[PDB]
Amino acid sequence: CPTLDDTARGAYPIDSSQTYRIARLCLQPTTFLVKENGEFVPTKLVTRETTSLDQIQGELKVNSDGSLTFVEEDGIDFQPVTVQMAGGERIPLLFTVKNLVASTQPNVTSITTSTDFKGEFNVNGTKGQISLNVAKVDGRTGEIAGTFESEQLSNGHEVKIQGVFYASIEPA
Protein backbone atom coordinates (compact mmCIF):
# COMPACT_ATOMS: atom_id res chain seq x y z
CA CYS A 1 0.00 0.00 0.00
CA PRO A 2 0.98 3.68 -0.20
CA THR A 3 2.81 5.43 2.62
CA LEU A 4 2.73 8.92 4.10
CA ASP A 5 5.36 11.59 3.56
CA ASP A 6 8.12 11.54 6.18
CA THR A 7 7.11 15.06 7.29
CA ALA A 8 3.39 14.23 7.57
CA ARG A 9 2.03 15.80 10.75
CA GLY A 10 -1.02 17.22 12.46
CA ALA A 11 -4.69 16.44 12.53
CA TYR A 12 -7.12 16.52 9.60
CA PRO A 13 -9.96 18.88 10.59
CA ILE A 14 -13.56 17.88 9.86
CA ASP A 15 -15.88 20.76 9.02
CA SER A 16 -19.35 19.87 10.24
CA SER A 17 -20.85 21.92 7.38
CA GLN A 18 -19.24 19.65 4.79
CA THR A 19 -19.53 15.98 3.94
CA TYR A 20 -16.54 13.70 3.52
CA ARG A 21 -15.52 10.40 1.99
CA ILE A 22 -12.74 7.86 2.08
CA ALA A 23 -11.33 8.12 -1.44
CA ARG A 24 -8.97 5.16 -1.04
CA LEU A 25 -8.35 2.59 1.69
CA CYS A 26 -5.64 -0.03 1.24
CA LEU A 27 -5.22 -2.92 3.71
CA GLN A 28 -1.90 -4.76 3.63
CA PRO A 29 -1.93 -7.94 5.74
CA THR A 30 1.16 -8.74 7.75
CA THR A 31 -0.28 -11.73 9.65
CA PHE A 32 -2.82 -14.49 9.07
CA LEU A 33 -3.78 -16.58 12.09
CA VAL A 34 -6.02 -19.66 12.02
CA LYS A 35 -7.80 -21.21 14.99
CA GLU A 36 -6.43 -24.64 15.99
CA ASN A 37 -7.14 -26.33 19.35
CA GLY A 38 -9.05 -23.18 20.25
CA GLU A 39 -5.99 -20.88 19.73
CA PHE A 40 -5.30 -18.44 16.87
CA VAL A 41 -1.91 -19.67 15.61
CA PRO A 42 0.39 -18.13 13.00
CA THR A 43 0.55 -19.35 9.42
CA LYS A 44 2.98 -18.65 6.56
CA LEU A 45 1.74 -16.69 3.60
CA VAL A 46 2.29 -18.73 0.42
CA THR A 47 0.76 -16.35 -2.11
CA ARG A 48 3.56 -14.51 -3.90
CA GLU A 49 1.39 -11.95 -5.67
CA THR A 50 0.00 -8.93 -3.85
CA THR A 51 -2.28 -9.71 -0.91
CA SER A 52 -3.45 -6.15 -0.32
CA LEU A 53 -7.03 -4.96 -0.67
CA ASP A 54 -7.03 -1.54 -2.31
CA GLN A 55 -9.27 1.12 -3.82
CA ILE A 56 -11.87 0.80 -1.03
CA GLN A 57 -13.98 3.92 -0.84
CA GLY A 58 -17.29 5.39 0.23
CA GLU A 59 -19.15 8.05 2.14
CA LEU A 60 -18.26 9.07 5.67
CA LYS A 61 -21.65 9.79 7.25
CA VAL A 62 -22.32 11.92 10.32
CA ASN A 63 -24.33 10.49 13.17
CA SER A 64 -26.30 12.35 15.81
CA ASP A 65 -23.35 12.13 18.24
CA GLY A 66 -20.69 13.59 15.92
CA SER A 67 -19.12 10.23 15.15
CA LEU A 68 -18.38 9.33 11.55
CA THR A 69 -19.52 6.14 9.85
CA PHE A 70 -17.62 4.83 6.86
CA VAL A 71 -19.81 2.88 4.43
CA GLU A 72 -17.85 0.85 1.87
CA GLU A 73 -19.39 1.44 -1.56
CA ASP A 74 -16.68 0.32 -3.99
CA GLY A 75 -13.20 -1.14 -4.06
CA ILE A 76 -11.47 -4.40 -4.79
CA ASP A 77 -14.03 -6.96 -3.57
CA PHE A 78 -11.67 -9.60 -2.20
CA GLN A 79 -8.18 -11.00 -2.50
CA PRO A 80 -7.63 -14.78 -2.60
CA VAL A 81 -4.78 -15.80 -0.35
CA THR A 82 -3.24 -19.15 0.50
CA VAL A 83 -1.55 -19.69 3.84
CA GLN A 84 0.36 -22.69 5.08
CA MET A 85 0.15 -24.18 8.56
CA ALA A 86 3.33 -25.20 10.32
CA GLY A 87 2.51 -28.84 9.57
CA GLY A 88 2.13 -28.12 5.84
CA GLU A 89 -1.63 -27.90 5.36
CA ARG A 90 -2.43 -25.17 2.81
CA ILE A 91 -5.60 -23.19 3.45
CA PRO A 92 -7.19 -20.86 0.86
CA LEU A 93 -8.79 -17.71 2.24
CA LEU A 94 -10.65 -14.77 0.67
CA PHE A 95 -9.46 -11.58 2.44
CA THR A 96 -12.30 -9.04 2.25
CA VAL A 97 -14.07 -6.12 3.87
CA LYS A 98 -17.00 -6.06 1.48
CA ASN A 99 -20.03 -4.24 2.91
CA LEU A 100 -17.96 -2.75 5.71
CA VAL A 101 -19.75 -0.29 7.97
CA ALA A 102 -17.36 1.14 10.55
CA SER A 103 -17.68 4.03 12.95
CA THR A 104 -15.45 6.32 14.98
CA GLN A 105 -15.75 7.67 18.51
CA PRO A 106 -18.24 10.50 19.08
CA ASN A 107 -17.63 14.19 18.58
CA VAL A 108 -15.38 14.04 15.53
CA THR A 109 -13.78 17.42 15.08
CA SER A 110 -10.64 16.10 13.35
CA ILE A 111 -9.03 12.84 12.40
CA THR A 112 -6.02 12.27 14.68
CA THR A 113 -3.67 9.51 15.75
CA SER A 114 -6.21 8.56 18.44
CA THR A 115 -9.11 8.10 15.99
CA ASP A 116 -10.37 4.52 15.62
CA PHE A 117 -12.87 2.94 13.23
CA LYS A 118 -14.70 -0.19 14.36
CA GLY A 119 -17.28 -2.21 12.49
CA GLU A 120 -18.47 -5.27 10.68
CA PHE A 121 -18.51 -6.61 7.13
CA ASN A 122 -20.17 -9.55 5.51
CA VAL A 123 -20.15 -11.08 2.07
CA ASN A 124 -21.37 -14.47 0.96
CA GLY A 125 -20.49 -16.87 3.75
CA THR A 126 -18.10 -14.57 5.63
CA LYS A 127 -19.15 -12.47 8.62
CA GLY A 128 -16.48 -10.30 10.08
CA GLN A 129 -15.36 -7.63 12.45
CA ILE A 130 -12.53 -5.13 11.95
CA SER A 131 -10.85 -2.36 13.90
CA LEU A 132 -8.72 0.33 12.22
CA ASN A 133 -6.27 2.02 14.61
CA VAL A 134 -5.10 5.28 13.03
CA ALA A 135 -1.41 5.88 13.82
CA LYS A 136 -0.36 8.81 11.61
CA VAL A 137 -2.21 11.69 9.93
CA ASP A 138 -1.11 14.16 7.27
CA GLY A 139 -3.45 17.06 7.87
CA ARG A 140 -2.42 18.77 4.62
CA THR A 141 -3.26 15.89 2.32
CA GLY A 142 -5.91 13.90 4.21
CA GLU A 143 -3.72 10.83 4.12
CA ILE A 144 -3.72 8.56 7.13
CA ALA A 145 -2.04 5.31 8.08
CA GLY A 146 -2.46 2.79 10.83
CA THR A 147 -2.90 -0.84 11.73
CA PHE A 148 -5.91 -3.11 11.48
CA GLU A 149 -7.21 -6.29 13.05
CA SER A 150 -10.02 -8.35 11.55
CA GLU A 151 -11.72 -11.57 12.55
CA GLN A 152 -13.88 -13.66 10.24
CA LEU A 153 -14.90 -17.17 9.21
CA SER A 154 -13.68 -17.83 5.66
CA ASN A 155 -13.77 -21.34 4.14
CA GLY A 156 -14.66 -23.28 7.30
CA HIS A 157 -11.92 -21.71 9.44
CA GLU A 158 -11.90 -18.93 12.00
CA VAL A 159 -9.23 -16.49 10.86
CA LYS A 160 -7.63 -13.39 12.30
CA ILE A 161 -5.91 -11.03 9.87
CA GLN A 162 -3.76 -8.14 11.01
CA GLY A 163 -1.71 -5.60 9.14
CA VAL A 164 -1.13 -2.00 8.11
CA PHE A 165 -3.40 0.34 6.21
CA TYR A 166 -3.30 3.59 4.25
CA ALA A 167 -6.28 5.79 3.52
CA SER A 168 -7.09 9.15 1.98
CA ILE A 169 -9.95 11.29 3.30
CA GLU A 170 -11.38 14.21 1.36
CA PRO A 171 -14.50 16.39 1.05
CA ALA A 172 -17.32 15.08 -1.13
Ligand SMILES: [Ca+2]
Ligand atom coordinates in the same frame (compact mmCIF):
# COMPACT_ATOMS: atom_id res chain seq x y z
CA1 LIG B 1 -3.98 5.21 17.37
